[PDB]
Design a protein around this ligand. Sequence first.
Ligand code: MNH
Length: 152
Amino acid sequence: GLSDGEWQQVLNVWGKVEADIAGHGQEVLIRLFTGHPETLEKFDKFKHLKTEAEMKASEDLKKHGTVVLTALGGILKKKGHHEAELKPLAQSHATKHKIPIKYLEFISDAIIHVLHSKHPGDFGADAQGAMTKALELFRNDIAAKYKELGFQ
Ligand code: MNH
């Protein structure tokens, strides 16, 4: 698990995200779609987005960014007692959306990059560590539900 000190750092970092959840959520998704265009194909609602300019200008992309990060914030604030919040996300991402676990690895890396991009020099070595642990716990707990389903 994460230690208390570690959960505290994660939640301190999450405070930075909450000041602009849509902005953060949009940049996360844009970072994902542009570094991994296969990921765009999982979204019929974003597949028409031919350019980064188009992605940037999509209010519906922002809205979904808000949905994504609100759900993750929910989970993070549970400090690993997150099974009730996590299991249904796991299940819809395997069964409905068909999201391989590697794509969750991609979006985890995108979150780390965006935190550095938006908080250069304000997201220290300790904070990166604690947030990376939190994101690995999230991803590992979803992996566990995927295995149960035999997904991927
Ligand atoms: C952080 C990681 C992460 C979180 C917290 C997340 C949370 C959500 C939530 C909440 C919904 C709406 C409820 C549901 O379960 O259908 C949802 C819908 C979705 N998600 Mn995801 N999702 C991903 C990663 C995430 N998703 C990744 C990675 C992929 C693609 C590569 C993805 C593709 C989807 C698709 C597709 C939908 C349905 C979008 C739509 O409304 O049309 N996403």
